[PDB]
Amino acid sequence: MDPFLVLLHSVSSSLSSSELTELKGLCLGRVGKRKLERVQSGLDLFSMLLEQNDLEPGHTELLRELLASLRRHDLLRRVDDFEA
Amino acid sequence: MDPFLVLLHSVSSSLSSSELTELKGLCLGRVGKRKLERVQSGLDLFSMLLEQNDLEPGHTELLRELLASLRRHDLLRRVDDFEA
Amino acid sequence: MDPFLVLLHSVSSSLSSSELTELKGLCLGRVGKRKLERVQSGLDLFSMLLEQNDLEPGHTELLRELLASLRRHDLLRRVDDFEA
Amino acid sequence: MSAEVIHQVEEALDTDEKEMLLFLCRDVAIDVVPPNVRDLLDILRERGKLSVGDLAELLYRVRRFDLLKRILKMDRKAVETHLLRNPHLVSDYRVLMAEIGEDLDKSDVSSLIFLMKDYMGRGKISKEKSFLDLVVELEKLNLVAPDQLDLLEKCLKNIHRIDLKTKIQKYKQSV
Amino acid sequence: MSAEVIHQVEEALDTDEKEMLLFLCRDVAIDVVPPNVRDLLDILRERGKLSVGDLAELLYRVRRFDLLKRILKMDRKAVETHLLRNPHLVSDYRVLMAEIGEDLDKSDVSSLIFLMKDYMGSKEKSFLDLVVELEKLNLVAPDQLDLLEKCLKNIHRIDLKTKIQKYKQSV
Amino acid sequence: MSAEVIHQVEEALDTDEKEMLLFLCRDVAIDVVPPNVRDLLDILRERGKLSVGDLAELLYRVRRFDLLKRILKMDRKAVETHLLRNPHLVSDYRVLMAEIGEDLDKSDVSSLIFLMKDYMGRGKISKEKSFLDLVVELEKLNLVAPDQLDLLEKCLKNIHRIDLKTKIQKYKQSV
Amino acid sequence: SAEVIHQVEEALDTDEKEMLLFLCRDVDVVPPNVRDLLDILRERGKLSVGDLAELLYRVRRFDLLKRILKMDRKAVETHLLRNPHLVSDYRVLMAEIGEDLDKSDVSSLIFLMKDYMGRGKEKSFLDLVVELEKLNLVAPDQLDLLEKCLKNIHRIDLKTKIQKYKQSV
Amino acid sequence: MSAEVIHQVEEALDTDEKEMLLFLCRDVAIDVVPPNVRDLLDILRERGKLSVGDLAELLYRVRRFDLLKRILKMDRKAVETHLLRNPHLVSDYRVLMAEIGEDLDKSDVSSLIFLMKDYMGEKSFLDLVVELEKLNLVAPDQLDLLEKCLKNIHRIDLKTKIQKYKQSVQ
Amino acid sequence: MDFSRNLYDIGEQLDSEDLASLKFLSLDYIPQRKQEPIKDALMLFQRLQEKRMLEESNLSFLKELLFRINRLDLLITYLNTRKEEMERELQTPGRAQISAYRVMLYQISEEVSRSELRSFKGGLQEEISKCKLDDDMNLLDIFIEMEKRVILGEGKLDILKRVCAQINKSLLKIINDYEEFS
Amino acid sequence: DFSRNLYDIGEQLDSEDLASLKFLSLDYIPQRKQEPIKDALMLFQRLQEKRMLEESNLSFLKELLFRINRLDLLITYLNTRKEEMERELQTPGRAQISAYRVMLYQISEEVSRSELRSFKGGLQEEISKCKLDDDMNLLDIFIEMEKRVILGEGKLDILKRVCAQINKSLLKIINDYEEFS
Amino acid sequence: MDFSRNLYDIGEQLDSEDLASLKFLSLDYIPQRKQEPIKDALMLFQRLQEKRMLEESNLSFLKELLFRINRLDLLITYLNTRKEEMERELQTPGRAQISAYRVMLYQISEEVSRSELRSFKGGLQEEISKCKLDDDMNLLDIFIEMEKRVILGEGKLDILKRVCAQINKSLLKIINDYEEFS
């Protein structure tokens, strides 16, 4: 979905290196360590998460949980505005 | 034709590696992963997209919005001035 | 699992630079200097400790011992609430 | 039907999609193996199973619509309607395999061939391979069939890719 | 049994499997050395050794199961049972050689030919050509295998040595 | 017409088309079979059925149009008009066989003779054969007739060549 | 001379011999072998030092001219203007065009011309010009079909060569 | 020992084996030069010079020990003893020429032909040797034209073998 | 299928650092020519399989490699062996297929900081004669380079002892423990 | 003797220089005979055939070797220096190779892989992408353009415009060659 | 059989960089036509064997080659020779098959870093005449390129000294030592 992809791009654009590292750690349970090593930005991480189908454009509960964990309510608000 | 090609080359010559990979992700839906693996230049990706005639001189709206998503003012205005 | 990881992230977030240095000095005996020279947060320190199997969600005695060594009763009661 | 159009299509095709076309045309040419695209097209023309619609369907499957506009002077709507109202030259199994192979990079086919090294040979697939070549090799040993896709689905599941498994389940539900 | 199956077999197999098929039937055709598969199959048909079961066995050794499913209208279970009960035509030595040669790559065969250049007289060839050349000089035999086993260890390849030892144990 | 033109035609024709001419002169020639074309032309001239205007048809049946302008000073229009306004010397079966033979290469005739090796004699297969020679051998046993095309059509379909099957069916429909 | 032809025939290649046969095909019986062609030419009296020198210059083997006939390219070039009787300009043009096509171009040419030509081993451009002449559509005065066929393989330089030849006459 | 033995030997031989045998049997082919290997074998058999030891010698010189074991029931040791004791059919000059031809790479023969084309005037080294012998430039006693040319192509390895043979003639 | 799945899954959890450590530890049974093309754990596993030291019926060497680089979660997760079992298995003589010299070198390398690495490189740069001026290398490469010039062997440790004594004292303690072991 | 020197010269040329020499000899060696050429020996033999490279006359070989910028073979075997080579080349009538080919080769030298891809990405109108193969050297692209009469002796506008597209340094070479007349 | 196996074992311990260094060092005795298709040390050993410089009886060239590239490990591991013996052999005149020119150039190549390499490449625009200023060229490749255009000769060392004077003076010391050697 093009709107979903552009929303994901916007979400990945607003992060920083420290938040990127924190997210990379927080996804160690699902994503393998070797694949997490090669990532350079959160956009690739989002694509890889889309790969295992645990995150899908129709249902983004994992994305909401991850964003709420990072104490970034603005991005969660953007996500739920997209949903509505 | 040739003006279209020179415009494409000019817009490709003014892109960065981060912009290159962000653009590569942003068009994940229309291009398979295998083809995107071997993409190293913006002109090659533009030609690959043109192969499916999604980007054409008669209809360049997709490229317009794709560049606008990257927040590039000068390139977008040059493209808008290309046909005029 | 996910509750264990989120608890670990939450307890690591409350750490400070001085607390991080104190924890690194205390943990210097557990692991090598090189493995402790690149760690920038207690989050990555716990990630490293998970490799040696000294820290696990089932058995967190070492974690609470280290936390009490820094005299942070809030983290002790937080982990107690998690496990009970 | 003329030789000129066949020659132009051959010389306008990149080396990457020639293998795609050869794999796609395996069903029609089941008794012989052609080395290049021109020989395959000549064999189809000789066999009488070649026409404007067949070429349009092949170019639509290979996703090179610009050549359809330039050479055959047709758009997506016309060829799609013709394919809707006519039998398909290529079965959905082959196009599904092509679409799956279109979604795997160079770092996954190596893992696939390593995983299945016990069932099949080793020294033959030691060279760099494409997913279509691996599918052909598996089909040679009669392990994957249009009605039998358990092994491929399980292998795709084992390499932490679920979306392709969902696509396989979708195709199986379709038929 | 007729020329239809022979024609389809000729037009189905590629050259890589054709070379292995030529190698496998080298010992049974003790007099003729056909360069193609058409004449080899014609000779087998004329001699009377060629049969449905024999053709299925030959295609099974080459590992082309779809041809058995399509042409001979048989599955792998039937030919497996036939091999279990009926005696084989190709010797176990030839199929063992083919299995060993299936695994070696270009670098390994290049190293092997460089090592073995002292015992013989340049070109680039597959492992099957090398073993044929060695058998010409009477250095590798169905009962003599010391040279190949010894040379396969110095190139740091021990699984093939274990395979050879297992075959020797099988006697 | 004269004896010098016969020599000129004989020296300007190669042995490759000599067999074609011999096959195309089967119905008319009934007394003996001459090994060479020169004796055949002499026999037809002696019989009186050979004329300067009729021989051009043979040229149009051998595809040697250069001699038409070089000797007969006639183009395709003149021979077409003559054929339209005069009876045909050769039956359509003979020209159809030559037309079929004109479109087959070595890889096909070899497969045909391999398939039909058992049909002919067991010891006769030693001598090298040709498609026209194979047709003559089959006609010796009368397994194929000018009005009979079922076996030939089946053999042509066996090598998966439907284009010639369509022409055979069209000729059968016409006659 | 007479025996020097032997020294010539041992110094020629198979493709060179084929080109020589195609060039001499203009002058009536076709020779199966080059030695027979030379013997026939000697018998008919057309064999001459100047004619052989012109033929060798056309086939571009100046080393044989220096060794056998003891002449250079300037002398034969001057002698050519007096009587170019052995080979016409059309045959020279055909040979020169044939000697400028690689394997891919000749393969494409035979594939394209199989549409309306007898399907019947691999042959070159010189081996196809004779068949076209037999089919009687490539004549020294008319060359439109050949030009159209040549334009389809994307070789405009040879088209300009054909145009130059047409303008020459 | 009958004609079927030599018939099977001719049938089983490879084309390169036939060419090498035809070249090697040149010394005894002074009476007539048969283009075909079977004709040469028949001529040698009818002349009485072709014995079992002769066939064993030829097979040992064409490196086909498998035929020796399978057909003549003889091994390399027996044929070596026969060669050492009984007189030799062919001179070692032909053997040295054949070995030199076998040891040369495919690319080097073209360079050798190019270098040697000035003296004379696709082609195997054996053809070059027989052509040079026809011109009577290289002979079993003079090898300067061959040794110097071999040294010229930087392949100094075969020069040692040539010098060894030259020292062996005294 | 299951064994290949287990091997692939284990190899999928190793980063560049662990890959480098694994490549260094098994230098004895893998020649440098075959070691350079190795870029991921799968090639390492294939190369080990060819020399017949890693199979579904023999997993000792893989366990030893995983234990030596201080990674035990993989041992208990996919191989189902605790620390105590592996320690007891290594206790008996002859079952260790990695020489004590190599593990001693690895343990020494694992305890050097950036400034310590710079001082180590500058201390012994005289012997290598300025060839090691690069500041982007690791200690294992320096050890390999010293091993190539046979200035640091199994029986020769004088240079290493002198340099570590100049740098610190704990490294000399480890070397003395290794020497007293033999 | 004489052939030994030619063999020595031809034994010290790599594949790239062999391709360069093959390109520099299109006028005298036809395209049909050029394909079988795979080593310098065959090219030297063909040049010997046309009687423009013999024992007495070595000017063409000297010029050809000097053109590809390799003076080592000149000084060592051919026994010549750069000064006298330039002195000879200043003669208007002794330039066997036209300045057009020299200009094309010099322009080919001054292009990198990224610049090569940029060139290949702006010519889809005339040359098919399949024939480009995305890895052909610039000499092959130049000969392909020459075959289709795109880059001609008097037709330099397309080359000039693509030059102005990519780099202005090569425009200096192009315009000085044009002003050479 | 043992000699060939020993040569193969020696060749299996050399990576790509060492093979390139050996190719540069042995450039004089093999033409470039037979040197370019060399993809492994085995082909180089075969080429040397053909030209009668390496054999079972004569090993004086292989030992010198291995000693020149500081591969002292393989000398004592397989060929059973010590560093001092090789040094004394090279001290005796008449047994140095490799001229001091090539070894001096290789020693210069050994003492240049990446930034120094790029500076050296950029400092030679006049001599290279804008032929190839790409950063992927090795220092040995640049030496070969300069040698082709007889810019840098056996006694024509002016350009090399002039360029090297900008970067460092130790390389000038090496060049002066080589000059004093003659």
What does this structure look like?
Chain G: Residues 1-70, 89-164 form the DED domain. Chain G: Residues 1-169 are annotated as: Interaction with FADD. The complex is a hetero-oligomer of 11 chains, with three copies of chain A (84 residues), five copies of chain D and three copies of chain I. Chain A contains six helices and no strands. Chain A is mainly α and 84 residues long. Chain A has a single domain, classed as Death Domain, Fas, CATH 1.10.533.10. The longest helix of chain A is centred in the first third of the chain and has 12 residues, at 2-13. Chain A starts with a helix and ends with a helix. The relative contact order of chain A is 0.16. The longest helix of chain D is centred in the last third of the chain and has 12 residues, at 163-174. Chain I has two domains: 2-91, Death Domain, Fas (Orthogonal Bundle); 100-181, Orthogonal Bundle (Death Domain, Fas). Helices cover 62% and strands 0% of the residues of chain I. Chain I has helices at residues 2-11, 16-25, 32-35, 41-50, 60-68, 73-77, 83-91, 100-109, 114-123, 125-128, 139-148, 158-167, 170-181. In chain I, helix 8 packs antiparallel against helix 13 and helix 9 (114-123) packs across helix 12 (158-167). Chains D and J meet through loops of D and helix 10 of J.
Structural class call of chain A reads mainly alpha
**Superfamily (CATH H level) name of chain A:** Death Domain, Fas
Shape of chain A: globular
CATH class category label of the largest domain in chain I: Mainly Alpha
Organism (chains A, B, C): Homo sapiens
Protein name (chains A, B, C): FAS-associated death domain protein
Domain DED (chains A, B, C): 3-81
Subcellular location (chains A, B, C): Cytoplasm
